[PDB]
């Protein structure tokens, strides 16, 4: 069985060989946070950035050193997507802006953001922004293909899908090559710079036992899911809140631990992250889209998801134990 908590413990154990004594001061203002952070983080050696972080906002004599570092990670993670910098753009989910090259020092900023993300993982701090699953796979050095495209470029996915579901640039290799290329298309230099910054703080091989979804949880934190909020803002197709399978689904959600609930949330929606307003504000690819459970096929069918529409295709299972066994397997798959 896959055990996230064990993987994190082994990850911490490995990070000890990189741990350094004492602290480093990071002096940043709230007005010019992004730029002060850039000059501060880039002025230190990787080895020094592995010492305890002492983030300081001049004028603020905050005794809560931990609270200020958490705040700096939260605030800086929001600045990563600021259009004024033209580094990352929305596609919570971020992607490298291909127009970033307009600033001739753009690769230095990607090296900086790379250090920042590796620092969050190294210091056990969460960020309030995130990336796509194919990009988490890239951080882990895991291969990416056609399945990873559906969530990033649906039109391109469907055209590549037509080459597979039917019969000139040097089929299975081509479709795989094209998919890989599309995922880092026109952002290859920025990506390489990001990884240079990332690897000097935390070699990406320290994360080798995690899958992409676990890495997202590690960067977000295992936030406690409000079960009542989830239930009040869940909609149904060919089912009702009084249906046996639905009542078993909610029983299954109460039974599993919070890591399993996040894994279920990632299975249905593609992310463990929730909007600030909760389940009512869930967004799909075509507009607002609340978590939806649909009755599909028969008892022998496996559970399926349509992450673009935050939709679970739940077969009409015979027992609660059949529902528990089929969903656990469906959400575990990597
Ligand atoms: Cl993965």
UniProtKB/Swiss-Prot annotation:
Subcellular location: Cell membrane; Cytoplasm; Nucleus; Early endosome membrane
Tissue: Widely expressed.
Residue ranges of the TM segments: none
Gene (UniProt): ITCH
Free-text note on domains in this protein's UniProt record: The WW domains mediate interaction with PPxY motif-containing proteins.
Consequence of substituting residue 308 to A: Loss of ubiquitin protein ligase activity. Results in altered endosomal sorting and reduced degradation of CXCR4. Unable to inhibit MAVS-induced activation of INFB
Subunit composition and interactions: Monomer. Part of a ternary complex composed of SMAD3, ITCH/AIP4 and NEDD9/HEF1; within the complex NEDD9/HEF1 interacts (via N-terminus) with ITCH/AIP4 (via WW domains); the complex mediates ubiquitination and proteasomal degradation of NEDD9/HEF1. Interacts (via WW domains) with OCNL. Interacts (via WW domains) with NOTCH1. Interacts (via WW domains) with JUN. Interacts with JUNB; the interaction promotes ITCH-mediated ubiquitination and degradation of JUNB. (Microbial infection) Interacts with Epstein-Barr virus LMP2A.
Function, in words: Acts as an Acts as an E3 ubiquitin-protein ligase which accepts ubiquitin from an E2 ubiquitin-conjugating enzyme in the form of a thioester and then directly transfers the ubiquitin to targeted substrates. Catalyzes 'Lys-29'-, 'Lys-48'- and 'Lys-63'-linked ubiquitin conjugation. Involved in the control of inflammatory signaling pathways. Essential component of a ubiquitin-editing protein complex, comprising also TNFAIP3, TAX1BP1 and RNF11, that ensures the transient nature of inflammatory signaling pathways. Promotes the association of the complex after TNF stimulation.
Stretches assigned to the HECT domain: 45-334
Mod. after translation: On T-cell activation, phosphorylation by the JNK cascade on serine and threonine residues surrounding the PRR domain accelerates the ubiquitination and degradation of JUN and JUNB. The increased ITCH catalytic activity due to phosphorylation by JNK1 may occur due to a conformational change disrupting the interaction between the PRR/WW motifs domain and the HECT domain and, thus exposing the HECT domain. Phosphorylation by FYN reduces interaction with JUNB and negatively controls JUN ubiquitination and degradation. Monoubiquitinated. Autopolyubiquitinated with 'Lys-63' linkages which does not lead to protein degradation.
MAP kinase docking site: annotated segments: 50-59
Catalytic-site annotation from UniProt: 308 (glycyl thioester intermediate)
UniProt organism field: Homo sapiens (Human)
Identification of the protein by name: E3 ubiquitin-protein ligase Itchy homolog
Coiled coil regions, renumbered to chain: none
First and last residues shown, out of full length: 525 to 897 of 903
